[PDB]
């Protein structure tokens, strides 16, 4: 709204990384203090520094907060293994008559080497046909990273309806797995000759087909 | 002190919610509290802050007179009420604490935070789920291993927990996340690695647990006779 | 008459019982006629083939099973009796045949794409050599431009 935060920021593990908070002259350049919060994806945010002058207990000294007039700056020295979160700029806004947060910056590099994906295609069972629906499953496992596109074809035209993709999750062996569902009905399930999945992972395309009849 | 908040809650677009904020210990009846909301896709917004010792409401101008806050002095907790739910209500609330200080700035700060209430609202409410057992085909097996599992389709709401033989087997198991369907349903799957020499001696049963709906359906997997 | 059968997307007698062709087939097949060497007068029956199989087979798999295929519901214990026939059968190659039954030497060259660096691949081709003109060249140590 009134506060605009950078979407992200690039840095190196060992150099100085800084961020800037820019707003209006009635909320941060007005004279009010700012507060910086860390939004870890999975735990509730805590307090890092208030007023840019006092260090709260349990917070390391490596975080530095400064106020360059109408803009606020946060500086860090060294990228450790817990900065994979979001940084927000929060201050009291007189026009909004309340506290408004910033946009949020992402500090995360990809760092994902390649791997060889494997796909499994399973036709629906007999008991699923009487449920007045046809759920086509399409499971992909043992791939890295978890960014695989999913395409459906019926040997004559691509399918652009009912296509879904789930977010992959980490496995026990630091791998990723995902599944794809397609919502059809047994009316035209038996009419077509065959159904398949087409996926592409860094140019590696594999095709698996099944025969209902 | 520490503040613990309730778990996930599901409601309807046009109903009322009931979220509680309790504090373990003291210093809850002397300092002002507030509510902070985080939503995936946008920033964090602040609806209003309530003094518990005086019982005086203090909201923001961006929010209309629809929500209400009450605070309790005996058992030292606060209640959340929100009526006429809308499509963007699917987010998480936080129960914050306000600590004042002295200085030129004098900005509102949230030192202490709660756990969080993930309130998701949509259509396609809770109903009895259906399980579809799957068996590997003859052409799908080439080595000494086979893949089999159980499917949970048309279930509501999150979260759900599955087990294999009531936790007897846990090697090679994997759980898949849900996905937002167009009509408002969810779908997950769970497959396990089974050697091909154990497809006719012992059986595997899939257990589904749905605590909001209190349903537990036991399903049996059978190999296909044709292929 | 079976060279048309080496293709992805059909069912027959040889392409499903000896060597299945998958849909993701980037293969490169070569066949030709050499009937003057692999065939001889009097009947050349050295090469065999499989005609009967219990079910289908995964592509890129070799089947060397010599077990007698059973058609009936009773065991035969390896006899040439009823409801049992030997799946491997002889050829009918002859150098005096026509064109649709001659011995053809067919080979398939397929490629593999994995997470490995290139091992067997075409090197850089030898282009034409030009002289007495301002051209650009690089002989292993410098990108030099000149005549």
Swiss-Prot record, chain C:
**UniProt-reported outcome of changing residue 52 to L:** In strain: Omicron/EG.5.1
Which parts of this chain are annotated as the region Receptor-binding domain (RBD)? 1-137
Renumbered to this chain, region (Immunodominant HLA epitope recognized by the CD8+) spans 44-52
> What effect is documented for mutating residue 89 to R?
In strain: Omicron/BA.1, Omicron/BA.2, Omicron/BA.2.12.1
Substitution effect: residue 49 to F: In strain: B.1.1.298
Query: What are the start and end residues of every segment in region (Receptor-binding motif)?
Result: 33-104
Annotated BetaCoV S1-CTD domain ranges read 1-123
UniProt name for this protein: Spike protein S1
Q: Name its species.
A: Severe acute respiratory syndrome coronavirus 2 (2019-nCoV)
Q: Give the organism's phylogenetic lineage.
A: Viruses, Riboviria, Orthornavirae, Pisuviricota, Pisoniviricetes
